[PDB]
């Protein structure tokens, strides 16, 4: 009975710390035992303990198993992934034999497998090619992905990752795609995105985005019954704000101005105002004037405290059309 | 393990039941956890929170929470299944839901944790079946009836007695993307690298457990002009080394003539590609074959073992350079004290080794010795490792000349000969 036998694996484990010695010949004994053995459940166990006693035996076997793996059940496969990791930082020179397998592992397909599989890879490597490989895995994954909690997690890794400050162009670019998925909301997730998103842009991959933003914007209009997305908007604007600072920006911007006119809540006005300030600093000017016109319309077109307030500053500001 | 505890929870600020896989501490780990859980941290919703790298994994199921905890990464779904799974199991296990029922079937419930999960491993399926394993069995019964009965017979009888008495590659390439004379500039159009490697294991006693020698002549020709040539091989070797010629090479020619040439003389050797025209192998137990014997004699003076090690060159032919004899040392004891020595030494505190280097070992100077002292046991000193490089081959085999197949004119050639150590160890 495999139940009984398996139970010994724990038990032994218990010995190995308490009185390992009690039995001393074990690591091999096990290892030969493995040979006798064939119940995956027990095997899985067998590995777990075996590496803890000694990796070497597992490795020898590993050599053996290399082709066979693919055929097999995951759980046992997992355990090796941990082991391999610790040793290289201490010392390497080992690769090929592994590689041969590893490539096979670049099938990868269980959500667990995949989850690890890209994760291990990065651990191992970070070549631009590597960067890409893993990246893909994620992106799809995400896309497939549903539990948000999960989603966040990978980000976090990702968040780490960025310190791959060799930071390739592309990758930043793939985001949008991913981002599209956001339209199936969950602000909180979205929000995490926005921050994340902002970062990559050296005031570039920008337009395509911007455009997209505008798309968002339309999308944002829609018919909406904002409750979560509203928040996003504010954030977005922040995210957005930053860029601009850096950038030279464009018509897109005009549109906010318009957009803003539509709207009816203070926080935005505050932003706007924020903009008031800023712009007051920024002055290359030209735009402003149009906008001032735009505004003139907006203004004519409108009433409110907010506005009322608006007038005041603007009034304060003043220039031509004497 | 993948979980040091599973605690099943009720809303109360308190977790309805729990089990501690491993004891050490007190509840304060668990107790503290309980407190935090009860508090919830006012936090609104969300079925997961991990904070500070600790997963606090939960599931509200009602007014109840079932909770698991972990700190380092996991594959989610599996997990979920479990929380949920718990949420499938209980009305079966302990009966429905209300603490009490469970209070009565505590034992059952805890038993279920273990049963279900053996240290963070999803053990099975099928609850009823799960019942089955213990306190529900089969074997024991089978045995009992027969046995009990048998005994019973003996007993009955006794009663009377008593009574009366491609793809991979794509990636791979992308990713992939002492010195010998390296450039083609410093080599003749005909060039041969003769390399030998030695694998040797010896007991401290001096017996030869195993010796393996492998060697080969690699031929490389830079100019087609040289393509049809024959190599003249000189063989002084007494050892009984086995030689094998490349499959393309004329075996008979080599045997009688000791010349290396292609079976078809008209054929040409490859250009700018290495060809292993000849290979040889020697495997032997005979100690006489050991190139350089090492004698290490630890002896323990009172408090403070003294180690004396010597080497002697058996084969007068060899000239060994950069010989390093690496001796392991006990640690925590401090540095070894060096007495009389031939050559020099390097002490590595981190490695805990004493590397003994040189003197050049020639026929003229066959032996040398080293003496040092350190506190330790004789076993601390082994295994001893020997490393060296030799310009001359162990096997007395050399390519004296090269001639053209047609006309048999002599041709200039260069050779690189190396004798390297794969492993040379003294147990």
Curated annotation (Swiss-Prot), chain A:
Spans of the HEAT repeats are 93-129, 130-167, 169-206, 249-286
Where does the source fall among the domains of life?
Eukaryota
Give the location in the cell.
Cytoplasm; Golgi apparatus membrane; Cytoplasmic vesicle, COPI-coated vesicle membrane; Cell membrane
Expressed, tissue-wise, as follows:
Predominantly expressed in the upper one-third of the oxyntic mucosa and in most regions of the pyloric mucosa. Ubiquitously expressed including platelet, liver, heart, spleen, lung and kidney.
Look up the further comments and give them. Answer: Brefeldin A induces dissociation from the Golgi of the beta-COP and presumably the other coatomer subunits.
Question: Could you give the subunit structure recorded for this chain?
Answer: Oligomeric complex that consists of at least the alpha, beta, beta', gamma, delta, epsilon and zeta subunits. Interacts with CAPN8. Interacts with SCYL1 and PRKCE. Interacts with COPG1. Interacts with ARF1 (myristoylated); this interaction is required for binding of COPB1 to Golgi membranes. Interacts (via trunk domain) with ARF1 (via switch I region); the interaction is direct. Interacts with KCNK2 (via N-terminus); this interaction increases the channel-mediated whole cell currents and promotes plasma membrane expression of KCNK2. Interacts with STX17. Interacts with TMEM115.
- Provide the function of this protein: The coatomer is a cytosolic protein complex that binds to dilysine motifs and reversibly associates with Golgi non-clathrin-coated vesicles, which further mediate biosynthetic protein transport from the ER, via the Golgi up to the trans Golgi network. Coatomer complex is required for budding from Golgi membranes, and is essential for the retrograde Golgi-to-ER transport of dilysine-tagged proteins.
| Listed name of the protein | Coatomer subunit beta
Organism per entry = Mus musculus (Mouse)
Curated annotation (Swiss-Prot), chain B:
**Organism this protein belongs to:** Mus musculus (Mouse)
Name its GO BP terms in alphabetical order.
adult locomotory behavior; cerebellar Purkinje cell layer maturation; establishment of localization in cell; Golgi vesicle transport; pigmentation; protein transport; retrograde vesicle-mediated transport, Golgi to endoplasmic reticulum
Quick check: keyword NADP in the entry? no
Q: Which residues carry this modification: Phosphoserine?
A: 177, 409
User: Which branch of life, at top level?
Assistant: Eukaryota
Gene name per UniProt: Arcn1
Q: Which UniProt keywords apply?
A: Acetylation, Cytoplasm, Cytoplasmic vesicle, ER-Golgi transport, Golgi apparatus, Membrane, Phosphoprotein, Protein transport, Transport
The compartments listed are:
Cytoplasm; Golgi apparatus membrane; Cytoplasmic vesicle, COPI-coated vesicle membrane
Annotated protein name in UniProt: Coatomer subunit delta
Q: Where is this chain primarily localised?
A: cytoplasm
The family assignment reads: Belongs to the adaptor complexes medium subunit family. Delta-COP subfamily.
